[PDB]
């Protein structure tokens, strides 16, 4: 629920519209008015501030760190995580089994490769 | 003698010790971690 | 004496029924992998193949209801931010 | 529904690892802990 509880007499469906002339007057009287005094951000019509990532207290730490590390990227539409090692889930080609490698090296090679 | 009973467990299966790199451990951290995301995508989305 | 053979004899070299008891060369293992690996390759080539016509004949006969479940999504997303600007455009209207 | 009798104790508390901080470590444990799974079901049924 909204918490404006300030009363001006304007009746838009009985009152004349008024003209830009008459619009730009009022707008012009309203920035003086805000240029008059200061504006209070302790107001009780506006809402509490947003917590920060450490003291929200359903963010993670690793939530954070990840929020972290989006607010640091320029692009952060754009911004992509690291991939995981798509490539070993591909088809193992055959290892270059040299003649100066070894036996245990080309078995552990070969067994590596069986793995995949 | 009658309500208390023993509990064996089978060797069957190689012993898993309870450490972190478990697939259902894995698991359980992403869907807390999924959890918590949602917990604060919703007050975010309540206080926007 | 089953987990004594599977902790001496490796478990990958324990899989393969070329492994003989009495072949203690290592260029007929280096060998018998080397065929279980080119099997295995083979294998893996033909089910990839499979897999491939399998996704292939799945997405020619689901293409459609893919992209009508993604104008639908299209369409409640729309329509969640219209109902959401209508509803704080009725708060307003109330208000005022 | 009757011959299973559920045991109630405390919650294991697994220690979370300081390499398991991040999303992308977290799921490279995963896939890891996955395809070596995958590798001893497949040598399971090789050996069978």
């Given at each position: ?32 008015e ?7 951000p302790?107001?009780a ?5 947003l917590?920060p ?16 590390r ?45 793995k995949? | 003698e009658?309500?208390?009973?023993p ?19 894995l698991?359980?951290?992403?869907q ?17 | ?66 992209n009508?479940?993604?104008?639908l ?24």
């Amino acid at each position: 629920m909204p918490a404006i509880t300030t009363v001006h007499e304007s009746l838009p469906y009985i009152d004349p519209e008024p003209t830009p002339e008459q619009r730009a007057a009022a707008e012009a009287l309203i920035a003086e008015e805000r240029a008059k005094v200061p504006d209070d951000p302790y107001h009780a019509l506006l809402p509490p501030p947003l917590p920060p990532l450490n003291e929200s207290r359903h963010l993670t730490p690793i939530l954070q760190n990840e929020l972290a590390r989006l607010a640091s990227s320029p692009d952060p539409q754009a911004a992509k995580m690291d991939a995981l090692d798509f490539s070993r889930y591909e088809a193992p080609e055959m290892p270059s089994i040299d003649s100066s490698q070894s036996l245990e090296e080309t078995a552990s090679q070969l067994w590596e490769t069986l793995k995949q | 003698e009658t309500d208390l009973l023993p509990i064996k467990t089978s060797r069957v299966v190689r012993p898993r010790p309870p450490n972190f790199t478990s697939i259902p451990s894995l698991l359980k951290a992403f869907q807390d971690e999924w959890d918590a995301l949602v917990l604060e995508t919703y007050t975010t989305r309540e206080q926007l | 004496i089953w987990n004594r053979r599977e902790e001496n004899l490796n478990a990958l070299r324990l899989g393969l029924g070329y492994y003989d008891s009495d072949s203690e060369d290592g260029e007929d293992d280096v060998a018998n992998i080397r065929a279980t690996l080119e099997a295995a390759l083979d294998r893996l080539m033909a089910s990839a193949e499979k897999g491939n016509k399998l996704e292939k004949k799945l997405n020619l006969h689901l293409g459609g209801y893919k992209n009508r479940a993604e104008m639908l999504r299209k369409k409640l997303g729309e329509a969640h931010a219209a109902l959401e600007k209508a509803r704080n455009a009725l708060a307003g209207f109330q208000v005022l």
